[PDB]
Amino acid sequence: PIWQIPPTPPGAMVNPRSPLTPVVDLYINSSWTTCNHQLGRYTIDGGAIGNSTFNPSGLWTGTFTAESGSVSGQTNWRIAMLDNPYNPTSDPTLPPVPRGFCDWGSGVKSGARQHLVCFTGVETDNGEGYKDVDAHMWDYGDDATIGLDNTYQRQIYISDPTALDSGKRYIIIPMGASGSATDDTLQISPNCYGSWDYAPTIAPPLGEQIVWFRSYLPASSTSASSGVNSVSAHISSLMSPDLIRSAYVSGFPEGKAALLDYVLYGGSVVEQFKMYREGYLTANAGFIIPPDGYFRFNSWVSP
Amino acid sequence: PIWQIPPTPPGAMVNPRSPLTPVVDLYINSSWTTCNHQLGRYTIDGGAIGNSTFNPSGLWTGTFTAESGSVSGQTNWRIAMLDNPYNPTSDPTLPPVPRGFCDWGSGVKSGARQHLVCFTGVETDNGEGYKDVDAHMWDYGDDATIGLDNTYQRQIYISDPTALDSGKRYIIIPMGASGSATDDTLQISPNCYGSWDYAPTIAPPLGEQIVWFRSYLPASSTSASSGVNSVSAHISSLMSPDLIRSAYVSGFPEGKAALLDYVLYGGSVVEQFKMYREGYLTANAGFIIPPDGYFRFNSWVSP
Ligand SMILES: CC(=O)N[C@H]1[C@@H](O[C@H]2[C@@H](O)[C@@H](CO)O[C@H](O)[C@@H]2O[C@@H]2O[C@@H](C)[C@@H](O)[C@@H](O)[C@@H]2O)O[C@H](CO)[C@H](O)[C@@H]1O
Ligand SMILES: CC(=O)N[C@H]1[C@@H](O[C@H]2[C@@H](O)[C@@H](CO)O[C@H](O)[C@@H]2O[C@@H]2O[C@@H](C)[C@@H](O)[C@@H](O)[C@@H]2O)O[C@H](CO)[C@H](O)[C@@H]1O
């Protein structure tokens, strides 16, 4: 059975790990030989494994509740707890965090060094919406204990000169990274522990690399005393749903990979890629490929 | 030529007219017998007609430039021009506004009662990104001439108590509607005319209705003397790209429509819709259908 791939350029696809920013390049790096992400992982057989979705934009915004306190030492870091509608009762066999929430990495207990940014507003006391939405810095855990600093839990802390209102609900739309956060710290993701079904960490076969659908993430700061010192950066994914949702019509034959041709201009230059059934695609071998081109189904090869 | 529709529920699809908020219902109304929208227009043959796109979230954010001026009387309304990076030659045969920008209606010669809201922030001095991004009431045109009030051009006005910086670029993320905006004023789209290729206004055959893929839009206001007075509303579309993207394997036979079965409640209940070649769906001759079901291909019928 042959596979028909529509001629959709990579520049017209969604970025699962960072919507609202179009794809700019295809990035291959020789220093990145693993992937422990939770968003953007798909499988031919199992569908959307891990904590991903087929509607990244719909589930990108979340809500949380203040807990009337602050972390020890730093009085500006108000503690708060994420709100999860998909798992009302805290059943250990289901993921704690809401579906589709971000997982960008920040550091092994990193404070002054770097943080992340978001939009945040209190409830309107009317049930209709929110008020006074502005930028703030946030992070997972409390950056004090090793057991829950990078643990992908439902407890976070947010910087605010004033004090949060206890028992009220706030909205979160995370967009930006602050402090000293480079590309490497964002590439890695916080660890996860428990008994729920989370996506494992893959590794490429010896002698191959991985495409990363790289994008560009700009900055958003605040001109005020102790404001938000943030910087521009880049963000990467593994696979977008648009490319892989086509294969469901005719699944991969047992123990077989696909050979793909990427055509840039006319027929002058053609690149050869290999797609596996576990989600990632490889390239034999470090540079950047332009995003204007179309994919082609060549043949089936053995892994 | 058979059509095989994957069992994706409508609750896991994107809303072209308003990303960042999932679809909650399927809405049919007897007072809406036309559609002059510019976002969400798709066809079997021409692909994305009008100003539509297959990546709604990528092109949702825009930018504009201030012009150092104000409308007569209401100085608070500073004029500005949208920035276009696809027709950088102001060619009349190409669309003026950028792809994927908002087209919510707000009324005719009437801005002492209603307005639209957007996240606006000024540029920094390093190219890193934007800064001090906050909510701002905005609208099309200048509310003075009949030919430039609701005309879908690249000139807008934004309310700001302070003075805008001339020649600086600002970012726009439209999210919310304020004042006295109800659902009827948002359903109608601003009129467009000229020489460029725009999408026409369709009408259903007599004896049928339209399914609208409706979604809920919350409110975001500001606590200040001349602050934002936003309201909660609903936003409807015509068709999401996920449903039409599959039909491209085998196009519809000439002069023929399709019958689709909507199966909910474990099959117990099943609805019957008719899908045409232009993009819209028709239901026999007013309520809300739940969003827990999957579409099923029944057969081909004559229109
Ligand atoms: C989260 C918080 O409350 N402060 C950030 C802030 O850094 C602070 C910090 O550097 C202290 C001393 O270390 O001095 C200032 O408060 C500083 O604020 C930042 O630096 C000044 C110069 C301004 O740029 C100000 O706008 C800015 O907020 O950011 C650093 C990043 O290194 C840390 O993240 C602190 O937690
Ligand atoms: C765009 C602008 O500057 N003002 C809006 C505002 O209405 C004004 C208006 O009603 C005038 C007199 O008509 O009186 C106030 O300024 C009023 O402001 C609004 O009402 C007060 C109580 C606050 O809520 C304020 O934040 C709010 O702006 O909204 C109306 C819609 O009714 C128009 O949009 C005006 O242009």
Side-chain angles (χ1 to χ4, degrees):
Chain A
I2 31 76
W3 184 16
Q4 70 285 0
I5 301 180
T8 302
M13 293 183 178
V14 193
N15 201 343
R17 213 162 88 96
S18 175
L20 301 176
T21 46
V23 182
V24 293
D25 295 313
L26 298 192
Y27 197 89
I28 45 189
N29 193 316
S30 59
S31 180
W32 296 352
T33 58
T34 178
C35 179
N36 67 114
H37 300 161
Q38 304 291 347
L39 305 180
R41 295 186 55 93
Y42 303 91
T43 315
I44 298 297
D45 310 328
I49 202 176
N51 204 263
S52 54
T53 299
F54 276 143
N55 192 344
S57 297
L59 293 80
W60 183 250
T61 59
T63 46
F64 74 90
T65 59
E67 221 186 26
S68 176
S70 64
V71 79
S72 179
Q74 279 74 1
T75 174
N76 297 332
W77 299 349
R78 270 69 183 181
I79 199 66
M81 201 137 60
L82 277 172
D83 195 73
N84 186 9
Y86 292 81
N87 189 35
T89 62
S90 183
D91 192 59
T93 56
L94 298 185
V97 306
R99 196 173 193 172
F101 213 73
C102 76
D103 65 275
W104 297 346
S106 64
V108 195
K109 255 171 306 205
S110 67
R113 294 183 181 277
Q114 64 180 20
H115 271 87
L116 295 174
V117 203
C118 65
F119 278 109
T120 305
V122 78
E123 199 179 12
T124 188
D125 300 329
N126 186 340
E128 284 189 345
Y130 306 91
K131 66 168 71 175
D132 284 323
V133 196
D134 53 336
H136 288 325
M137 289 178 289
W138 76 300
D139 220 356
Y140 276 107
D142 57 330
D143 290 351
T145 307
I146 185 62
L148 66 158
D149 55 354
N150 283 337
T151 191
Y152 203 56
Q153 204 71 24
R154 55 192 297 260
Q155 176 185 176
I156 55 183
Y157 72 87
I158 291 185
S159 179
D160 191 0
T162 62
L164 273 62
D165 303 338
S166 312
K168 302 299 179 59
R169 282 178 173 82
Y170 296 70
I171 184 184
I172 274 193
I173 307 177
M175 273 305 171
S178 74
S180 170
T182 57
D183 307 50
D184 303 7
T185 58
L186 289 182
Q187 171 62 27
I188 211 174
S189 63
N191 307 13
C192 55
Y193 311 115
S195 60
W196 55 288
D197 193 1
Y198 53 85
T201 59
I202 64 178
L206 276 304
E208 295 175 359
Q209 300 176 354
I210 320 246
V211 207
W212 294 114
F213 294 82
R214 179 238 251 169
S215 190
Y216 179 74
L217 177 63
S220 175
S221 60
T222 287
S223 65
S225 58
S226 70
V228 203
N229 64 34
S230 63
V231 294
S232 61
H234 289 192
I235 195 63
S236 305
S237 301
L238 187 55
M239 173 68 69
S240 63
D242 305 0
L243 175 59
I244 204 178
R245 71 149 53 102
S246 302
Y248 290 152
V249 174
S250 299
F252 283 64
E254 310 176 20
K256 225 68 174 298
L259 194 61
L260 295 178
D261 295 332
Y262 184 56
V263 189
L264 284 167
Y265 295 89
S268 305
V269 44
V270 50
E271 299 286 343
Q272 301 275 329
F273 292 147
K274 294 185 58 181
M275 183 175 180
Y276 297 94
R277 65 188 311 172
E278 300 173 1
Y280 66 106
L281 62 80
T282 45
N284 176 86
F287 52 90
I288 294 169
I289 303 301
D292 44 334
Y294 63 118
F295 289 103
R296 280 179 42 81
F297 171 78
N298 188 16
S299 179
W300 309 92
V301 301
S302 179
Chain B
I2 325 180
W3 185 14
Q4 195 169 4
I5 302 180
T8 301
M13 294 183 178
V14 195
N15 202 342
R17 280 245 297 179
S18 77
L20 285 70
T21 59
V23 175
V24 300
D25 292 315
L26 298 192
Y27 189 84
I28 53 179
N29 190 279
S30 59
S31 301
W32 297 351
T33 59
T34 178
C35 179
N36 63 328
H37 296 173
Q38 306 270 230
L39 305 179
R41 303 280 307 194
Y42 301 92
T43 175
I44 301 291
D45 310 359
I49 198 178
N51 256 77
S52 305
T53 173
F54 282 99
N55 185 17
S57 297
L59 299 323
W60 184 250
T61 74
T63 177
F64 72 91
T65 59
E67 229 186 24
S68 71
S70 64
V71 325
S72 67
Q74 298 95 349
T75 71
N76 215 271
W77 300 345
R78 322 302 161 103
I79 63 180
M81 297 198 66
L82 284 171
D83 192 72
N84 192 339
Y86 302 69
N87 177 197
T89 73
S90 318
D91 183 278
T93 81
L94 280 313
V97 296
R99 278 187 176 181
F101 205 76
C102 163
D103 65 325
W104 304 342
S106 60
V108 278
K109 293 179 179 179
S110 49
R113 334 120 136 145
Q114 34 184 13
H115 262 103
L116 329 132
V117 213
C118 69
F119 252 110
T120 311
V122 46
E123 184 126 352
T124 333
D125 343 88
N126 334 341
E128 211 70 12
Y130 284 95
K131 66 171 199 206
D132 328 317
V133 196
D134 60 300
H136 271 287
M137 288 209 241
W138 76 283
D139 235 288
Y140 276 107
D142 62 333
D143 207 341
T145 63
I146 183 60
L148 214 64
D149 200 322
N150 46 100
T151 184
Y152 203 24
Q153 283 202 13
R154 53 177 293 178
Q155 176 183 353
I156 57 181
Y157 72 88
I158 160 186
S159 179
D160 188 11
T162 61
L164 245 58
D165 302 62
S166 61
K168 299 298 181 299
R169 297 220 305 178
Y170 295 72
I171 184 183
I172 271 191
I173 306 179
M175 187 176 182
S178 72
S180 172
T182 169
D183 314 6
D184 304 71
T185 59
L186 288 183
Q187 174 64 23
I188 307 182
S189 183
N191 289 337
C192 66
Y193 42 73
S195 60
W196 57 288
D197 181 78
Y198 55 86
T201 299
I202 64 180
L206 61 96
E208 282 87 358
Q209 312 285 7
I210 307 181
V211 186
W212 289 102
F213 288 77
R214 181 177 65 83
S215 179
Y216 178 75
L217 172 68
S220 66
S221 60
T222 281
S223 159
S225 65
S226 61
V228 162
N229 63 347
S230 72
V231 269
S232 43
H234 296 252
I235 292 177
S236 55
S237 174
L238 193 55
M239 164 168 288
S240 62
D242 301 1
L243 177 63
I244 294 169
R245 226 202 293 252
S246 64
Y248 288 138
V249 175
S250 181
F252 295 172
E254 292 188 354
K256 203 165 300 182
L259 271 187
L260 298 183
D261 291 333
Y262 192 25
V263 170
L264 177 63
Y265 292 150
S268 81
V269 193
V270 42
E271 293 177 350
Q272 322 276 285
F273 298 144
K274 184 160 56 185
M275 180 174 177
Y276 284 94
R277 214 173 204 270
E278 319 290 351
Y280 57 96
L281 295 174
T282 59
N284 213 293
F287 59 88
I288 294 169
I289 302 116
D292 296 77
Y294 56 94
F295 298 95
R296 182 180 176 181
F297 173 77
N298 188 277
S299 59
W300 310 87
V301 296
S302 179

